[PDB]
Amino acid sequence: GSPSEPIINFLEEWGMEPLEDYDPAQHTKSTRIFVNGVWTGIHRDPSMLVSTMRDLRRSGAISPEVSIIRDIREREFKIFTDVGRVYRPLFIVEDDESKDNKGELRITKEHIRKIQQGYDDDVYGWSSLVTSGVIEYVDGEEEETIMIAMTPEDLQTNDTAKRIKPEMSTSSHHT
Amino acid sequence: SFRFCLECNNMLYPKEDKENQRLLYSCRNCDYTELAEDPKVYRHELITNIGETAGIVDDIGQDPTLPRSDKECPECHSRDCVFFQSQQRRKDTNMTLFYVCLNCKKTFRDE
Amino acid sequence: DTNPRSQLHSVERTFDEVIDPRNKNRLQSLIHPRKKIKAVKAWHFFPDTSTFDQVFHSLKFVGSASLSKDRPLNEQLGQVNASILTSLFKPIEINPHNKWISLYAVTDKLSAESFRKSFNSIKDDNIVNRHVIYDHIKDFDQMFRGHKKLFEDFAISFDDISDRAFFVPIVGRLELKKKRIVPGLVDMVNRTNYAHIRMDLRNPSTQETAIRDSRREQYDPVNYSSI
Amino acid sequence: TKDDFSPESKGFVENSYLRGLTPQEFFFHAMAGREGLIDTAVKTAETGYIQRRLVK
Amino acid sequence: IKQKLETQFTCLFCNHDNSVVCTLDKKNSIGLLECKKCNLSFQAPINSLSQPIDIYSDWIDACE
Amino acid sequence: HTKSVYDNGETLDISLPIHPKSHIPQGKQDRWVVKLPDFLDINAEPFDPRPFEMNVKTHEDKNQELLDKLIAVNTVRWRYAKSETGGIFKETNSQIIQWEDGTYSLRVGSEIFDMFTTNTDDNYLVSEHNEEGILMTESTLSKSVKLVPASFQSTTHQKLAKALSAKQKKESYARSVVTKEDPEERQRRLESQENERYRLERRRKQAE
Amino acid sequence: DDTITTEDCWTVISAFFEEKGLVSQQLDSFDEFMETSIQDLVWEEPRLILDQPAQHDNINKRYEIRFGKIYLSRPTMTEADGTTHAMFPQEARLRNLTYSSPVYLDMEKSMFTSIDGNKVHIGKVPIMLRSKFCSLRTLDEVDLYKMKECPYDMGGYFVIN
Amino acid sequence: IKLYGREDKGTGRTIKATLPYVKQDIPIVIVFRALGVVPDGEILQHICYDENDWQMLEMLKPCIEEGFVIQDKEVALDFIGRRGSAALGIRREKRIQYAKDILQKELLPHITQEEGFETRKTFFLGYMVNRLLLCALERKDQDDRDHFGKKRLDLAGPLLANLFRILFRKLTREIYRYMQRCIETDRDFNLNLAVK
Amino acid sequence: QSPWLLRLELDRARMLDKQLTMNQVADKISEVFSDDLFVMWSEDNADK
Ligand SMILES: [Zn+2]
Ligand SMILES: [Zn+2]
Ligand SMILES: [Zn+2]
C-alpha cells in the first residue's frame, strides 16, 4: 500500500487535465485516467505519459509496487497503489526502437558480478537491481498488456529425447 | 442521432400538424417547434453490423501483444501491418480479420 | 546549495542570463533541450501595474449555457463580436438559497463598436460621456470556486511592439448554467432585474484614483508611492 | 500474441511424459488435472444423495 | 383504478395514529387521504410515480 | 416565440470610473489562462536581495528544504535595473520562447518549461467591481495552457523526483517507550482509592 | 557484452531470497500495522465530546477528550508478585504465556465553558515473531542459541497461550 | 445500477439505480437531476461519447421518458428524500437536507466527501451507465469474476486493523458511558479509571 | 386512415431459404389483423 498523492502530483505536472475542463464533444479522442479506481482526469497523449510513469517507477521515484496499466483498446490508463495486490518480478527487455540494445535483456554480466561481489564499484542487492531498471514487479492486471518471453533464449530467432519448443509462426515478428 | 431544443436543451419529440400535414419536432416543456427534414421517424435493426469495424483507435499500433503480419496495405503499401479479429463478440460472430497499417491505419480484409 | 548566499547568487545569475529579444544571434544560439529546434521569437515576461488594483475572475459557461450552442442568442447578438466583448454582468441574490446572474449587452453594433474603441483607447485624460444603454439578454445559475493561493491562475497578454508579455492574477472561477425560471416566481422575477441599464462614462474621481494608487503601492512603489 | 488459435496456444501438449513438458503445457495440463479433481470431489456427494433417495 | 391502502400515518387534527387510509386513483390522477376517525378528506394531484408517501408529504406541506 | 419577460424599462444611471491602461492589445483581445505548477511560483514584488538573503529559512526536513529551494530558484521575479544612461528600467528574469514548430515555452533562467494549449470556447475574463456589485468583462480566454518540464534531465524535474521519492520514504508514527512497572498498577490503585472514598462517603451520608 | 545463462538467473534468485526471505509478506504487513495503522485507527475518531447547558445561570460546559500519540514497548511479563521483566518467546511457549506488548495512548482532557492526561494503558497487542517489535530481531546468531531459539526458525507467527 | 426489462419483454428497458439507505429503486434520470444536471442534453453528454451511436440512445430513450415527470433539482431531491428510509413525516426542507446529506455522503464515498465537488460523481455515474449499456449491447464480454487481477489478499495488517477498529470503538463507547455515569458526581475523574 | 407509414425490410436470403412467399406473409398479416391495416408488398424482383 502506498499513498496516491505523489501519483496525482506527477500526473498533473505532466499535462493531465482535470474533469471540470472536460467536454465529451470536444475531447472525443482523449484517454481517461483512473487512480485507485476513481476517474480523476483526461489526457490527450497517453503514450508519453505512460512512458514517463513507467520510467519514473523504474528509477525508484515511484514505489515499485505501483501498478501502471494502459488499456489501448478501451482508451483507459489505470493506476493502482492499493494494498493486497499479488505481484511477481520479471526481467526487463529493452524495447526502445531508437536504442541499439533493442530486443535484449537490460541485465548484463556486470550486474551479475556486482551481485556476487556484494557492492558497487563507485550494499548491492536485489533492491538495487529493482531500482536500477533491470527488474520490475507486475501484478495480475498489468500482465494483460505485456509480452513475456519464457527464457532468454526466446529473445532471438532431430533428437528423439529433447523436448520441442513452440513454433510460434502466427506472428512474423515479436517485440 | 436526435436533436434537442436550442433554448430548453430538452429532447424534441416528433409531431404532426393536422391543418398543415407536416412533420414537426416539438419540445414538451416549451413551445419551441422546428420543421422536420427527414421522414424516417424511427428505425429498428433486427440484424446489425455496427460495432464490428468501428472499434478502431489511432494508436493501436503501439500494442506489443498484437500479432504483426506482412499483408500489403491498399493505401500505404507498407510491409508491416497489425491484424485482429472482430471486436464485436456475439456468439455468432464471424472470425474475419481486420488489418491495420502503421501509416494510414486503414481497416481492410483479405476477402 | 542550501546556503542563503548560494541562493542569492543563483538569483542574480538567473537575472543576468536573460536573453535580449533583439539579439537574433543569441536567440538562434538557444536550442530546445529535447526538440533540438532553434528559437524564433522571444517576449519579456512582466507583471501588469495598472490592473493589480482590479479583481479578475475567469467566467465560463457550463454545458448547454454555451453561447455558441444558443443559436438564436448568437444571431441576435451577432455571429469577435464587440457586443460580447462589452457585456455586463449583475449578480443579484434575493436570499442565500436563491441566486442568479443577469447578463446585459449592447444590441446595436455601432454603439458597441464605439464603446469598445473608446474603452480600448484609454491612454489620455479625456473621456466622452457615452450614455450607452444595455439590454437584458438572459439569466444563468452561478457557482463559484475560490483560489487558496493568490496567483493560482494567471492570464497572459502579449505586446509585440515592446516584445513583452503582461500577466494578471486570477482570483476565482465563476461557472454559469442555463436556469429555467419557475412559472410561480415570475411575479417576483419582474421586480428583480431591469429591461435596460444606462452606462455613463466619467473620469475617475481623485479620491478613488488615490485609493487605487494606494492599493497598487504594494506592487510598484517607485512610480506610485504617496509623497 | 493476441488472437492465436494455433494448437500449442490453446492447450495441446505435443510432447510425451518421457520427453518432458514445456512450462505452458505444464500449466495447461495442471488446469485439466485440477478440473478432474474438482469434478470427482463434487460429483461424489450428488451420487451419494441420489443413492440414498433410491434406497429410501 | 382506485387503490385503497391502509397507512400508518398520524392525523394532525385527531392525533390518533394508524387511522389513515390513502386512496389514489391513477385514472383521474388524484389521491385522497381520509382519517378513519376524523372523517377529514385531503385531495392532491398525483403523477405516474406517485406513492402514498408523496401524498402524505403533500398533506404535511398543506397543513403547514 | 418565448416572449421577453422584462418589459418595465426601468434603467439605472450608474457611471463607472475607469483608469487608463499601461498597455493595449493589438488585433485581438485574446489571453491565455495558465495553471501555475507547484514547482513554479510568481513573485510580483520587486526583487529585494537583502531581505531575501536575510529571510532564507533552514529546516531539518530535507524534502521541505529542497522543495523550498527549488521553488525559490524557479520563482518568476523582477527588479529595477539602473540604465547606463542614468534612467530606471523594469528588468525581469523570465522570457517566453517560441520554437520553429510554433510551440511556446516559459523560460526562467536556464530552465525551460513547455506549454500545452487546449482551445476553450465561451471562456472570458472579467473585472470585478465589488463596491457596485457588477462584473465588467475584460477579454476572452481562448486557450488553456499547461506548463510541463521539458525533459527528464532538467534539474527541476530531478529535484521534484528526489523530493517526492524521499517524501514517501519517511513513515514512522508510533514512538517506542520502555515499561518499568505493571501497566495495570494505576488502575488497581485508583480503584482501591475510589472504593475507600466510596465507603467514607457512604458513612458520611448515613451520618448526615 | 556477454550472454546471460541459467546460472546467472539462479544468482539473481539467490539475491532475491537473500533480501526478502520466504515469509517477508507476513512480517512486512505486521510492521506496517504496528508502525502506522494503529495511530490512524485511533485518529479516525480523535474526539469524544460531552456538553451540558447547566441551569441549576446559563452555563454551557463542554467536556472533550482528545486522543494523542501511540506509545509501544517491547513485550514484557508481569509476574504475580509484581516484578516485571523482558519476555522472550521460548519462556512464553514453556509457561503458556502470550507474547504481547502494552500499548499506551495520550488522552488530553479539555473543559470548555461558555456562559450563554498522560500515557494511559489501553491494552496489549500480540507481537509477531521476528518482526520489528520482537525481541529476536536483534541478538545476532550467537545469542539466538543462548535463548534456546532455532536459527532456522523464520518467525511470522504469534504465540497465544 | 440494475437494467430492468428482458429481451422483448417489460415494455421499456428502464434503468433504476439503488442507493444506500433508500428503500426503493430510483430511475437514473432522477438521480442525475438530483446531483444537479437538469437538462437532458447535458445528461446525454455525461453518459454517451458518440452521438452516432443511435443504439445506446434508443436504449436511453425509455429512461428519459420515464423521468420526464421530474424537471427540477429541488423536486428531485425531495423525491429521493421521501424514500430515504428516514423518520416518517419529515418536513420538506428537512427532507431536502437529508437528501443532500445522503447524496454528498454515502454515495460513492471513495470519490469525494466535501461540498461543491459533485461534478465528479456525475461523471462517474455517466461512466457506470456507459459500461452497463456497453455490456448490455453485447459489445463487450461481461467482467470475469475469476480474473485474479481483480482480487486482493488480506494479510496480518488489514485483518488486525479491522479487529482493532472494532475493539477500539467498543472501548470508546465504554469510556463515553462511564463519563456520562460519573459526571453526575461532578468529580475530577482520573481518566485512568474510565479506560478498561 | 392515418398518415403514419409502417414499413419493414425482409432479408431476401433467409426469405428464400425458408421457401416463403411475400403474398403468404401479407396474407398471414391480413388474417391476424383483418382489415385494420392496409398492406402493400414489393414484388420478388425488387432489389430489396
Ligand atoms: Zn424545453
Ligand atoms: Zn502505411
Ligand atoms: Zn383524525
Tab-separated table of N, CA and C in Angstrom, chain A residues 163-164, chain D residues 13-30:
chain	number	residue	atom	x	y	z
A	163	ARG	N	12.962	-32.076	-25.800
A	163	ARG	CA	11.596	-31.625	-25.999
A	163	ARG	C	11.520	-30.596	-27.121
A	164	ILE	N	10.290	-30.280	-27.516
A	164	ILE	CA	10.013	-29.446	-28.681
A	164	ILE	C	9.456	-28.113	-28.202
D	13	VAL	N	-0.588	-30.474	-25.744
D	13	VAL	CA	0.724	-30.884	-25.268
D	13	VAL	C	1.320	-31.789	-26.339
D	14	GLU	N	2.308	-31.267	-27.062
D	14	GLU	CA	2.908	-32.012	-28.159
D	14	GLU	C	3.859	-33.091	-27.662
D	15	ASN	N	4.483	-32.882	-26.507
D	15	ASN	CA	5.499	-33.790	-26.002
D	15	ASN	C	4.862	-34.997	-25.323
D	16	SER	N	5.715	-35.876	-24.818
D	16	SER	CA	5.319	-37.027	-24.026
D	16	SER	C	5.880	-36.873	-22.622
D	17	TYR	N	5.435	-37.748	-21.723
D	17	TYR	CA	5.922	-37.683	-20.352
D	17	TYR	C	7.404	-38.012	-20.282
D	18	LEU	N	7.863	-38.943	-21.115
D	18	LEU	CA	9.288	-39.241	-21.164
D	18	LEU	C	10.081	-38.045	-21.675
D	19	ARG	N	9.540	-37.337	-22.663
D	19	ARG	CA	10.259	-36.213	-23.251
D	19	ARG	C	10.210	-34.980	-22.361
D	20	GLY	N	9.150	-34.814	-21.593
D	20	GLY	CA	9.028	-33.681	-20.699
D	20	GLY	C	8.166	-32.582	-21.286
D	21	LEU	N	7.492	-31.850	-20.409
D	21	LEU	CA	6.542	-30.822	-20.807
D	21	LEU	C	7.154	-29.439	-20.652
D	22	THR	N	6.882	-28.566	-21.615
D	22	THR	CA	7.309	-27.183	-21.520
D	22	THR	C	6.435	-26.456	-20.503
D	23	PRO	N	6.873	-25.291	-20.009
D	23	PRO	CA	6.100	-24.631	-18.944
D	23	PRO	C	4.651	-24.351	-19.300
D	24	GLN	N	4.373	-23.923	-20.533
D	24	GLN	CA	2.994	-23.653	-20.922
D	24	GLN	C	2.163	-24.930	-20.925
D	25	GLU	N	2.694	-25.997	-21.524
D	25	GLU	CA	1.998	-27.276	-21.498
D	25	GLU	C	1.823	-27.768	-20.072
D	26	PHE	N	2.822	-27.529	-19.222
D	26	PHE	CA	2.709	-27.911	-17.822
D	26	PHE	C	1.538	-27.206	-17.157
D	27	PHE	N	1.391	-25.902	-17.393
D	27	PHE	CA	0.292	-25.171	-16.773
D	27	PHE	C	-1.058	-25.626	-17.306
D	28	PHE	N	-1.172	-25.818	-18.622
D	28	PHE	CA	-2.448	-26.269	-19.175
D	28	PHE	C	-2.825	-27.644	-18.638
D	29	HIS	N	-1.852	-28.552	-18.565
D	29	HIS	CA	-2.116	-29.887	-18.051
D	29	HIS	C	-2.497	-29.838	-16.577
D	30	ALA	N	-1.891	-28.921	-15.819
D	30	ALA	CA	-2.290	-28.729	-14.430
D	30	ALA	C	-3.728	-28.237	-14.328
